[PDB]
Amino acid sequence: LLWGLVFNNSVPVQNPKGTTSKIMVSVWAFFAVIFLASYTANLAAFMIQ
Amino acid sequence: VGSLTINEERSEVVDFSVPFIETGISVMVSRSNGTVSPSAFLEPFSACVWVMMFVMLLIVSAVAVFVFEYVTIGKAIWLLWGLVFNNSVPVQNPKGTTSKIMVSVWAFFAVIFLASYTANLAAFMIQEEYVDQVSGLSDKKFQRPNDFSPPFRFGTVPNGSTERNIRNNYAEMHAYMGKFNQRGVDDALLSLKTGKLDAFIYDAAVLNYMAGRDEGCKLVTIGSGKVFASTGYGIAIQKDSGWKRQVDLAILQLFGDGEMEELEALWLTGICHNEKNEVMSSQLDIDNMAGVFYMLGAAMALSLITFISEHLFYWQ
Amino acid sequence: LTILVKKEIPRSTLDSFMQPFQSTLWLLVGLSVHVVAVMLYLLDRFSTLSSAMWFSWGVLLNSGIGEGAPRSFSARILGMVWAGFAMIIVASYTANLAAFLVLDRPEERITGINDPRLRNPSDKFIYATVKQSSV
Amino acid sequence: ERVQNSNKKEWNGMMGELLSGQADMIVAPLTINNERAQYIEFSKPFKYQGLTILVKKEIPRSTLDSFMQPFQSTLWLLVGLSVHVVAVMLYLLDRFSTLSSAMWFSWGVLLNSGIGEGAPRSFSARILGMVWAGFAMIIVASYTANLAAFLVLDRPEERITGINDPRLRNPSDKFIYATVKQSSVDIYFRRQVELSTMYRHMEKHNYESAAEAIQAVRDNKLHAFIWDSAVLEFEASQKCDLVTTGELFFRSGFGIGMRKDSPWKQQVSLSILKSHENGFMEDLDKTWVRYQECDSRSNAPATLTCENMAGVFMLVAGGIVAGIFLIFIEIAYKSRA
């Protein structure tokens, strides 16, 4: 689950019951959205150069 | 021989020569720019294909009707919206789906279309020919300076023929520069560097020369350097001189050989001429989403329209 | 014959760094997440309150948290236009990364031997041409 | 022209007529030369322009056309079969410690889709699924990267360098220049010994009408035409597929010429100044010049037509009837099983 949270996940996952870790997903603040976009941006940079 | 503007006020007194240099008057300003393109940046993505998505919203839904012959049609439309989109929300799970194969027929069009879309947004971010100058002096920046809320105050040479031309043409902008006029052009350059002066009107030849001679050439003229008043540089001649015809013939000789390019190359070079480029824009605060917010609030009005129309449908 | 000069300082890397661009419109659009949550709550009020806030956070962050579509389809329509809003948000995010990582550098080079910074030298330019040399 | 009859240097054409007094004056794009001023009175230069070369505009490279598709002529279906391979090996990991669905689930985790299945009970299979997810993410990152490969950074640099191009200084058969007859640039090139690097080629391809020099560039015969900017930039900005070099080859202006000793010039040139003072010249520009009927030189290249994406939708339409036939086959399979 945390691997897919690093990734762009699609698979069905756990649903925790008494989760305050659902707030910790907002603390995760999607790092796919940050990191992968910056990664493909630098791949675009390397494709430029 | 100095650098005299050929004008009517001197031709009546002294005799002119053939102008060797075409020159003219423009306005030098120091500009700070960015990449400011509003919410219509998606004008390459024409909406005529976007409705081409929307009928593909419907037709496979009809095939879903036969999958419903084995929860409803109106529930799956936002599923298909998220299938266009990057969906995250929990959705339906169809039981006897061969439409799960039709998701592979969909072959994610988010993955194709959105990536191509942000690729072309990267292209437009690469290529946005942004300008900030105000050409067309009939704009209110020279007509109604107090209509904005900086008080625009411009300056020029007080003992200059250009301000005499300005008092001869418009009606009153010389008096608008009566608040401040700069003697000494380097003082005007430093005043525009320090943001005191708003705009400096002068002859665009020396303006172009000093702008190319400046290190960080954000101090540029208006537009492509196209002047509004244009003249030449002549020579003061004692009237009824027989030699001056021979002089002007010699000027046509100096135009015949092409040495004046080399004489300009004595000084023309070193310029950052080089200006249709793009500089980076950190944190650039564009507020084009306010236009998107106008679409948002309009949709909020539409939702209210649906709420009242449903309420009258509760009355029926 | 060549001229040696100092190398220019590099512009940016992971340093005092270009952060997310939202000095403005960061928390204000955060409050609009609360606004769209409560107006959809009002759309469900007269025809799921705190969860609706966090669900609206998740549909900002592309997260699968708990809730589904409301029973009024106009609220789902507003959710879809919100999803398009979040997608153009992240598209503009990728676009502003593309804004500052390429295309620009300070052009601070000489043009060759015909530079008027040497042909018409000022105080801001010093040349050595060391003693007893052929040059 | 030096007439060979008794060595007579007579100005050809209408200039000889006003030399003989057939007219008092002339309005024209009057090129100013030294040899003209020895016989002709001239006024102040009414127009300011320069010498430029007009050539044909380059064909645009790519849009939605016969289009750059997905790059996978190779590694398309083969990595598709590896989806089947990773599905069955994970099935084997569940076989000795969910078969056809595992194929479609592996398709979904290629396509970032939420189809049905979850993680297997063996955690090594989930580990292989995670490295497969990293594989699909570097697949789509490379997809965005190859879009970034071909939409920017490149164009064929097919421009002139200016007047010092050796394709004109040392001209070959693949370069044709017009320099139309009885023009001032012909005397200018006769005055330049450095333009004796072939001037005779320019005499061999001399033309008569400027519109024929336009058409021969449009017929791709003439490679370049030298003319004043005031005509060239305006006709290029009104009639497209023709672009200029932008480089000013020679500084020049247009005055008005009269015969000798007509005293009106003192008020004529001042009237040219007077029409300059009210901006009546700019009234002429607003009535004729500002109507530019073409696009800019900026190719921004960031433009998009969206007509040729329907070829993907045809594949969706073929998949529709394929799903209909598969529905019939599954109906028959329900009849069997």
Tab-separated table of C-alpha atoms in Angstrom, chain B residues 92-213:
chain	number	residue	atom	x	y	z
B	92	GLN	CA	-19.121	0.907	-9.445
B	93	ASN	CA	-18.062	-2.702	-9.842
B	94	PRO	CA	-20.095	-4.166	-12.727
B	95	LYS	CA	-20.915	-7.847	-12.392
B	96	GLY	CA	-21.210	-9.297	-15.896
B	97	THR	CA	-18.848	-6.774	-17.423
B	98	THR	CA	-17.390	-7.154	-20.827
B	99	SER	CA	-17.097	-3.388	-20.443
B	100	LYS	CA	-14.037	-4.125	-18.315
B	101	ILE	CA	-12.559	-5.090	-21.670
B	102	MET	CA	-13.906	-1.769	-22.937
B	103	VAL	CA	-11.712	-0.053	-20.350
B	104	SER	CA	-8.791	-1.682	-22.158
B	105	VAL	CA	-10.392	-0.409	-25.365
B	106	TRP	CA	-10.357	2.990	-23.640
B	107	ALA	CA	-6.608	2.285	-23.422
B	108	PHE	CA	-6.231	4.922	-20.947
B	109	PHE	CA	-7.042	8.145	-22.709
B	110	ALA	CA	-5.979	10.068	-19.643
B	111	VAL	CA	-2.540	8.472	-20.106
B	112	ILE	CA	-2.488	9.439	-23.777
B	113	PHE	CA	-4.378	12.721	-23.857
B	114	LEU	CA	-3.353	14.379	-20.581
B	115	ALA	CA	0.328	13.626	-21.159
B	116	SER	CA	0.137	15.075	-24.662
B	117	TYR	CA	-1.775	18.026	-23.210
B	118	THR	CA	0.819	18.869	-20.571
B	119	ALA	CA	3.487	18.270	-23.210
B	120	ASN	CA	1.925	21.005	-25.326
B	121	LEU	CA	1.587	23.160	-22.212
B	122	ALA	CA	5.319	22.645	-21.792
B	123	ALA	CA	5.636	23.709	-25.440
B	124	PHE	CA	3.654	26.877	-24.783
B	125	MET	CA	5.716	27.492	-21.653
B	126	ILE	CA	8.789	27.194	-23.867
B	127	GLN	CA	7.246	29.466	-26.508
B	128	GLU	CA	5.255	32.373	-25.070
B	129	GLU	CA	6.137	35.632	-26.825
B	130	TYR	CA	5.271	37.872	-23.895
B	131	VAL	CA	5.358	41.665	-24.146
B	132	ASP	CA	4.677	44.399	-21.611
B	133	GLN	CA	5.270	47.677	-23.483
B	134	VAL	CA	2.376	49.982	-24.360
B	135	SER	CA	2.676	50.949	-28.001
B	136	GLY	CA	0.087	53.271	-29.444
B	137	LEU	CA	0.642	56.570	-27.573
B	138	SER	CA	-3.102	57.341	-27.760
B	139	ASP	CA	-3.398	54.875	-24.866
B	140	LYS	CA	-4.432	56.581	-21.600
B	141	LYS	CA	-0.892	56.198	-20.171
B	142	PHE	CA	-0.189	59.335	-22.213
B	143	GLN	CA	-3.797	60.591	-22.258
B	144	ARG	CA	-5.245	60.014	-18.763
B	145	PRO	CA	-2.303	59.497	-16.380
B	146	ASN	CA	-4.378	60.077	-13.242
B	147	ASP	CA	-6.956	57.473	-14.294
B	148	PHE	CA	-4.495	54.867	-13.061
B	149	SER	CA	-3.240	55.073	-9.533
B	150	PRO	CA	0.291	55.756	-10.058
B	151	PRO	CA	0.504	59.423	-11.039
B	152	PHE	CA	2.448	59.103	-14.279
B	153	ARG	CA	5.136	61.781	-14.562
B	154	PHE	CA	7.537	61.802	-17.499
B	155	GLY	CA	10.645	63.837	-18.208
B	156	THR	CA	12.798	65.074	-21.061
B	157	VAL	CA	15.406	67.683	-21.928
B	158	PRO	CA	14.089	71.177	-21.061
B	159	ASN	CA	16.162	73.021	-23.661
B	160	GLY	CA	15.322	70.476	-26.353
B	161	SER	CA	13.577	70.748	-29.706
B	162	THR	CA	11.670	67.509	-29.076
B	163	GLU	CA	9.644	69.001	-26.239
B	164	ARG	CA	8.982	72.001	-28.481
B	165	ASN	CA	7.580	69.564	-31.037
B	166	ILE	CA	5.526	67.928	-28.276
B	167	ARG	CA	4.108	71.292	-27.217
B	168	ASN	CA	3.440	71.870	-30.923
B	169	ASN	CA	1.550	68.605	-31.508
B	170	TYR	CA	-0.515	67.018	-28.759
B	171	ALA	CA	-1.771	69.789	-26.539
B	172	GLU	CA	-0.426	69.589	-23.017
B	173	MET	CA	1.977	66.683	-22.345
B	174	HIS	CA	4.875	69.138	-22.070
B	175	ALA	CA	2.987	70.617	-19.113
B	176	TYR	CA	2.475	67.038	-17.941
B	177	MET	CA	6.267	66.825	-17.961
B	178	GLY	CA	6.292	70.217	-16.253
B	179	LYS	CA	6.373	68.305	-12.970
B	180	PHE	CA	9.893	67.077	-13.791
B	181	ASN	CA	12.317	67.339	-16.712
B	182	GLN	CA	15.773	65.758	-16.664
B	183	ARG	CA	18.848	67.630	-17.841
B	184	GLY	CA	21.536	65.012	-18.350
B	185	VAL	CA	20.469	61.734	-19.931
B	186	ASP	CA	22.495	59.548	-17.556
B	187	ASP	CA	20.543	61.052	-14.666
B	188	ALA	CA	17.360	60.030	-16.490
B	189	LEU	CA	18.751	56.516	-16.975
B	190	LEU	CA	19.588	56.198	-13.285
B	191	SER	CA	16.217	57.698	-12.320
B	192	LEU	CA	14.483	55.079	-14.455
B	193	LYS	CA	16.757	52.461	-12.888
B	194	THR	CA	15.672	53.614	-9.423
B	195	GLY	CA	12.003	53.723	-10.424
B	196	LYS	CA	11.650	57.480	-9.984
B	197	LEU	CA	10.935	58.239	-13.631
B	198	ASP	CA	8.148	56.250	-15.262
B	199	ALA	CA	9.132	56.728	-18.922
B	200	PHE	CA	11.754	58.729	-20.817
B	201	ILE	CA	11.024	60.191	-24.250
B	202	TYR	CA	14.075	60.875	-26.413
B	203	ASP	CA	15.616	60.287	-29.821
B	204	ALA	CA	15.650	56.546	-30.398
B	205	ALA	CA	19.059	56.471	-32.105
B	206	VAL	CA	21.073	57.314	-28.996
B	207	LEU	CA	18.445	55.448	-26.964
B	208	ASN	CA	19.121	52.272	-28.972
B	209	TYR	CA	22.858	52.891	-28.670
B	210	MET	CA	22.796	53.324	-24.891
B	211	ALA	CA	20.371	50.410	-24.518
B	212	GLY	CA	22.759	48.125	-26.349
B	213	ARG	CA	25.604	49.615	-24.327
